[PDB]
Design a protein around this ligand. Structure first.
Ligand SMILES: [Mg+2]
Ligand SMILES: [Mg+2]
Ligand SMILES: [Mg+2]
Ligand SMILES: [Mg+2]
Ligand SMILES: [Mg+2]
Ligand SMILES: [Mg+2]
Ligand SMILES: [Mg+2]
Ligand SMILES: [Mg+2]
Ligand SMILES: [Mg+2]
Ligand SMILES: [Mg+2]
Ligand SMILES: [Mg+2]
Ligand SMILES: [Mg+2]
Ligand SMILES: [Mg+2]
Ligand SMILES: [Mg+2]
Ligand SMILES: [Mg+2]
Ligand SMILES: [Mg+2]
Ligand SMILES: [Mg+2]
Ligand SMILES: [Mg+2]
Ligand SMILES: [Mg+2]
Ligand SMILES: [Mg+2]
Ligand SMILES: [Mg+2]
Ligand SMILES: [Mg+2]
Ligand SMILES: [Mg+2]
Ligand SMILES: [Mg+2]
Ligand SMILES: [Mg+2]
Ligand SMILES: [Mg+2]
Ligand SMILES: [Mg+2]
Ligand SMILES: [Mg+2]
Ligand SMILES: [Mg+2]
Ligand SMILES: [Mg+2]
Ligand SMILES: [Mg+2]
Ligand SMILES: [Mg+2]
Ligand SMILES: [Mg+2]
Ligand SMILES: [Mg+2]
Ligand SMILES: [Mg+2]
Ligand SMILES: [Mg+2]
Ligand SMILES: [Mg+2]
Ligand SMILES: [Mg+2]
Ligand SMILES: [Mg+2]
Ligand SMILES: [Mg+2]
Ligand SMILES: [Mg+2]
Ligand SMILES: [Mg+2]
Ligand SMILES: [Mg+2]
Ligand SMILES: [Mg+2]
Ligand SMILES: [Mg+2]
Ligand SMILES: [Mg+2]
Ligand SMILES: [Mg+2]
Ligand SMILES: [Mg+2]
Ligand SMILES: [Mg+2]
Ligand SMILES: [Mg+2]
Ligand SMILES: [Mg+2]
Ligand SMILES: [Mg+2]
Ligand SMILES: [Mg+2]
Ligand SMILES: [Mg+2]
Ligand SMILES: [Mg+2]
Ligand SMILES: [Mg+2]
Ligand SMILES: [Mg+2]
Ligand SMILES: [Mg+2]
Ligand SMILES: [Mg+2]
Ligand SMILES: [Mg+2]
Ligand SMILES: [Mg+2]
Ligand SMILES: [Mg+2]
Ligand SMILES: [Mg+2]
Ligand SMILES: [Mg+2]
Ligand SMILES: [Mg+2]
Ligand SMILES: [Mg+2]
Ligand SMILES: [Mg+2]
Ligand SMILES: [Mg+2]
Ligand SMILES: [Mg+2]
Ligand SMILES: [Mg+2]
Ligand SMILES: [Mg+2]
Ligand SMILES: [Mg+2]
Ligand SMILES: [Mg+2]
Ligand SMILES: [Mg+2]
Ligand SMILES: [Mg+2]
Ligand SMILES: [Mg+2]
Ligand SMILES: [Mg+2]
Ligand SMILES: [Mg+2]
Lengths: 150, 118, 59
RNA sequence: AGUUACUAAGGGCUUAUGGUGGAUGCCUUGGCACUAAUAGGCGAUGAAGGACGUGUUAACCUGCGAUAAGCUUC
RNA sequence: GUGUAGUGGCGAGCGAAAGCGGAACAGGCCAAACUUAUCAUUAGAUAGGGGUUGUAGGGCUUGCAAUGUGGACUUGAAAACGAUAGAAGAAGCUGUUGGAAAGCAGCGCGCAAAAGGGUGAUAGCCCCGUAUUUGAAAUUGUUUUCAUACCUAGCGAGAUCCCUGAGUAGCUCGGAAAACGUUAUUUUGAGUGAAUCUGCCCAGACCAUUGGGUAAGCCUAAAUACUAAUUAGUGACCGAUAGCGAAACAGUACCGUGAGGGAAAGGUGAAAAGAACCCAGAGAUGGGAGUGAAAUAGAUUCUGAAACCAUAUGCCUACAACGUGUCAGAGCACAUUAAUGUGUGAUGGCGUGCGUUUUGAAGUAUGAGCCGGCGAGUUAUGAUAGCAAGCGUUAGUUAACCAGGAGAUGGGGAGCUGUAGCGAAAGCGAGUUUUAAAAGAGCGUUUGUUUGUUAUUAUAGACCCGAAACGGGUUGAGCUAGUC
RNA sequence: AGGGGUGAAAUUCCAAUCGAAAUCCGUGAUAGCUGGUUCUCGUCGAAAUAGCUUUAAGGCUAGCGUGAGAUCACAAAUAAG
RNA sequence: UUCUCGCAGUCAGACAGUGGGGGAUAAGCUUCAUUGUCAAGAGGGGAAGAGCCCAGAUCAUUAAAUAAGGUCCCCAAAAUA
RNA sequence: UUGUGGUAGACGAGCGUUGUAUUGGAGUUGAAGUCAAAGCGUGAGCAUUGGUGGAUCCAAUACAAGUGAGAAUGCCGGCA
RNA sequence: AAAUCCAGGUACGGGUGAAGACACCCGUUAGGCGCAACGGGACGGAAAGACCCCGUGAAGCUUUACUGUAGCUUAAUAUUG
RNA sequence: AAGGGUGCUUGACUGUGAGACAUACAGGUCGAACAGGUGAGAAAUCAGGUCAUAGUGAUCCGGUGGUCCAGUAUGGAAUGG
């Protein structure tokens, strides 16, 4: 395309802009889509979100959830899942190898966890802080191995 | 970018003014009254097209009715005879015949009068 | 936009976007309800479709 | 006896012209928002801001201060 | 990081501190010990040496190694880069329309100069300039070099002695600061009040263990905030109702006792060559003449719209019930964006305006005297949904910042979304919560991300106009009320 | 000298204004209440109902409209039994 | 006309027939259920009329057949017994 | 073949103004503006000629908006 | 000059209609245009009704309405033997 | 019979719950069937309060009992779940 003839893909650039003040021929004149003389037709707006006209809102009607660990943050974990790790190409899965594969950031010290049930064909040698009993069963059903770092 | 209105309002206003040419005083001078008169005149024109279609039929019926009463026949029976004889002619052309061609109009009335239906 | 502090602490989300909630009438006046009513109100629920739209933009 | 035009004191319509008026169009020793640098003060050695006065020159504006529309030096 | 932990009549709302990525980076100095000299040395005071801390430091006594490196630092000398005036600075003629050439056409030329302004129209080569090369007697700014003051220096041994900031830290009673509506931490109006490196404070009440740090003394460049002003320049900014209220002599005229409020108004022509002279008139002025391309460009000075006021060709109108038009329709008068043409309309049929708000308006409801200009859905930051494009299954994409034209962009992977869910949570994991249960039931056992456009929405004044009001500051007792 | 003054007292007077001056500022106060909101064509096209509401001239959800997608029959309409 | 998603407007209704409540078998009254119209709908009949009857306007035609209603004149159209 | 009354409202397709970027073109042998006329379009709208006017303007494809006036006892100016 | 003014070429009777018509339906009357008068109508003009109601409006005032507070009073504590 | 009397008892249970009624939401109503351990009865069977429909109040806040959860460096505690 030249600079004197440049075109967008159809139905990508231009869409029908709803002009609210330019005449009745567009169907959006005078009132401009607000309705007629009520609260929603003034400049203020649409009240508050969640309001119910004075009736107790839904959130104010329902009991509050409880936070057992008040003031704490859940310990984040980096999880290696067995259904997808097969797609990744590597053997002897340790922290350093994941760093080279850039699954984990080198500036992170989160403990590695092993999760999954899906059967894997080739054997892998994991170095994981935590592993499920049946995930370990699947891994050791093949000729792989898992060592639990402490 | 301050777009300024000029030649846009005046052109569309002068169109309405041009349409309302020949009106009484301010009805052709001021744009507002001119616009109202054109809309009202358009409504009148629309309604009178329909009313013209009906009024000219009535006038043809009246002329045809008169042309028949001079010969002793009535409109109500003339059309019935026309239908039974299968003759299909507008009252417009029939009235035009009775005003322009008295002899041939009299020929049509003579055939519808007595000749065997079909 | 700020998430409403009352919308949270009362509405937890799920995998498919459903908004979990707790049943009301479970704070006091226990003898005025039957054990069937109490054990049915103990379980949690989800907001109805009439409120799903209003809670989605609230969270 | 019957059917009849001319009237225009004045008014209406179309078109053309003249007058009041400054809309539209073009322009601007003027404004606005910033960029890159400089600088971020003046004053008892009299400040900022004013009054008065000064011409071969009516008033106003600007400059100037009894050395008064300018004085000396580089 | 996140609108996260939290804080909120747990309502409206408010909202960090760690960590990570960047811009810049710098650490110094007193009091006390100890010692010197002097003060009727009652010093408990003055002036010096010594010292500045946490993997504790310093002083006391005793040795080795040192003559340096660096400053937030004083005076000078020299040099460089600038600022406040400037100098030089290339290249065209002919013909045509035209009042006028620079336009147009022919043939050329210069360029580190084709930014711009003027010149009788629209000029690279007519002029001033611009690119580029340069230049300061005098004042002033930045940097560098040399010298010169001031400050600035390591590692041991022994002694077991001394010093390390008091109405201070804590505590109680009322407040506050931090995101916190008072509470671990910080601060203070009243009261009380400690200890001295085996010491004191801190790690969200508090105690013990562990660890971190040295309060009650001071100074500290850089990155950061802003533009009244000076120089250069830019604008998908405005172009006399716009842009500053103010293009003009605008905070003026004017209004008010005062504080205070506050306008309108630009354009002759290339050049005044601004109309000598004649006629009418008292004169202004007008009509000729003259200049000029144009005087219907004449100082009333670019163009000159509508409402409004007058003149006239043509048609109609003085027995006529009219939202004034429409459909038919004679006669009259003309001839065009050549079209079953145009102007008027004797007469016949039909016919109670436009917006607003209402169940319902011709309305005895409302708003507009007419004309012209101005006048009301936007922007910034986020969320959802539709459409489309880029990249894709260990995906996708950068924010700040740096370089680059006030650029596209490159670097920057800090982070954000998705990849595994369930549970209040520890926790488990294609499972998980409930439960004695594996039974039953709830939720899951998959379909992504970054942009562009549109629609809606949240915070902001949020489509525009309109209150009576409230709070804070100033000006008024020249009118009037009281008193002297 | 103004949440003040003065008042032989009437809500008098305080610069033609006084149930509490004038002016500037917060300020573009707020208004569920009036008024206004500017070009065109085509397709489709409502409601004035229920519950709650310090709610009754307002608001939320449901009912009725519109755009996109799915469901082909077992879904939904019109007649007969 | 069922299900899912985006965007709404509506919460003042009116009259006519039919079955009732309140009123007095009064109201162009008020409150309900149901069938229609108007609201948001012109045309023809009703002399004139938002809601009654006939019906549903894409534009042009000086074409034809009809619905409610009507045929002495206004005003289109009739005659017999 | 079935359709095309319509307010609130939903959806789709377009016109017009100013400027910018790429192309091309017109203009003192007369551009914009401005007036008149017996033209062309389904609609916003678009041309042709002549008078006045004296220097800029037009067409196409995209982009950005202070982008469309008949009403607000709307503001300003003029005139009834 | 002035308020006023949607454009007007602006009759009466009965009826109708948003329920009291210069403009609608049916009839009657009326040559075009002034001047001097007087006020019947144009629900005439001037004042976004002061009466009534509505607004989760304002302001002034009152009290054993609520929450506070200036001032007054009592005690502890410091100055304080 | 769902009314009256007698004997034995406490199902006036624990964890649940396919499917429906009615509903804007929040809530309400009926309930087969499963596991545990019981009561009556020889057994079949019945019992998750009464012949049925009124006898009831959300959220926030704080208190009480239990508890296989948290415990702001660690062990507790405080304070929460
Ligand atoms: Mg519409
Ligand atoms: Mg809308
Ligand atoms: Mg309403
Ligand atoms: Mg309105
Ligand atoms: Mg509304
Ligand atoms: Mg309430
Ligand atoms: Mg305009
Ligand atoms: Mg005459
Ligand atoms: Mg005349
Ligand atoms: Mg020179
Ligand atoms: Mg030169
Ligand atoms: Mg030039
Ligand atoms: Mg402490
Ligand atoms: Mg605070
Ligand atoms: Mg220590
Ligand atoms: Mg702790
Ligand atoms: Mg210390
Ligand atoms: Mg101005
Ligand atoms: Mg002006
Ligand atoms: Mg004065
Ligand atoms: Mg002259
Ligand atoms: Mg003039
Ligand atoms: Mg002029
Ligand atoms: Mg006559
Ligand atoms: Mg007569
Ligand atoms: Mg009449
Ligand atoms: Mg007539
Ligand atoms: Mg007529
Ligand atoms: Mg009429
Ligand atoms: Mg309008
Ligand atoms: Mg009304
Ligand atoms: Mg009414
Ligand atoms: Mg009237
Ligand atoms: Mg009235
Ligand atoms: Mg009104
Ligand atoms: Mg009026
Ligand atoms: Mg106007
Ligand atoms: Mg999107
Ligand atoms: Mg980048
Ligand atoms: Mg399961
Ligand atoms: Mg994609
Ligand atoms: Mg006095
Ligand atoms: Mg007050
Ligand atoms: Mg009184
Ligand atoms: Mg007075
Ligand atoms: Mg306002
Ligand atoms: Mg209010
Ligand atoms: Mg339709
Ligand atoms: Mg209805
Ligand atoms: Mg109903
Ligand atoms: Mg209301
Ligand atoms: Mg709704
Ligand atoms: Mg009703
Ligand atoms: Mg009702
Ligand atoms: Mg009825
Ligand atoms: Mg009744
Ligand atoms: Mg009744
Ligand atoms: Mg009624
Ligand atoms: Mg309505
Ligand atoms: Mg009708
Ligand atoms: Mg009729
Ligand atoms: Mg139709
Ligand atoms: Mg027929
Ligand atoms: Mg018939
Ligand atoms: Mg007849
Ligand atoms: Mg339609
Ligand atoms: Mg353009
Ligand atoms: Mg022209
Ligand atoms: Mg505008
Ligand atoms: Mg009546
Ligand atoms: Mg009123
Ligand atoms: Mg109140
Ligand atoms: Mg209030
Ligand atoms: Mg005391
Ligand atoms: Mg018994
Ligand atoms: Mg019993
Ligand atoms: Mg409470
Ligand atoms: Mg602990």
């Amino acid at each position: 395309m030249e600079l004197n003839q440049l075109k967008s893909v159809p139905k990508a650039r231009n869409h029908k802009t709803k002009t609210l003040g330019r005449g009745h021929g567009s169907g959006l004149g005078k009132t401009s889509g607000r309705g007629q003389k009520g609260q929603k037709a003034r400049k203020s707006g649409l009240t508050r979100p969640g309001f119910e006209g004075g009736q107790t809102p839904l959130y104010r009607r329902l009991p509050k959830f409880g936070n057992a660990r008040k003031g704490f943050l859940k310990q984040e974990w980096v999880v290696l899942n067995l259904n997808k790790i097969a797609k990744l190409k590597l053997d002897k899965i340790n922290r350093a190898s994941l760093i080279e594969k850039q699954v984990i950031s080198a500036k992170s010290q989160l403990p590695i966890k092993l999760i999954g049930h899906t059967k894997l064909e080739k054997p892998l040698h994991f170095e994981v802080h935590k592993v499920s009993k049946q995930a370990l069963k699947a891994v050791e059903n093949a000729n792989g191995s898992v060592k639990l770092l402490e | 970018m301050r777009i300024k209105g000029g030649k846009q309002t005046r052109v569309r206003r002068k169109k309405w003014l041009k349409q309302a040419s020949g009106s009484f005083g301010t009805r052709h001078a001021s744009y507002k009254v001119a616009k109202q008169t054109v809309i009202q005149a358009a409504k009148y024109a629309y309604r009178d097209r329909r009313n013209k279609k009906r009024d000219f039929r009535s006038l043809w019926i009246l002329r045809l009715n008169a042309a028949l009463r001079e010969q002793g026949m009535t409109y109500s029976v003339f059309i019935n005879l026309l239908k039974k004889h299968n003759i299909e002619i507008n009252r417009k052309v029939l009235s035009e015949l009775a005003i322009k061609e008295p002899s041939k109009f009299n020929l049509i009335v003579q055939k519808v009068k007595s000749e065997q239906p079909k | 936009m700020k998430v409403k502090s009352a919308a949270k602490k009362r509405f937890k989300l799920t995998k498919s976007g459903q908004i979990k909630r707790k049943h009301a009438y479970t704070s006091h006046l226990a003898p005025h309800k039957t054990t069937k009513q109490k054990r049915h109100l103990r379980k949690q629920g989800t907001v109805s479709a009439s409120d799903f739209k209003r809670i989605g933009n609230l969270i």
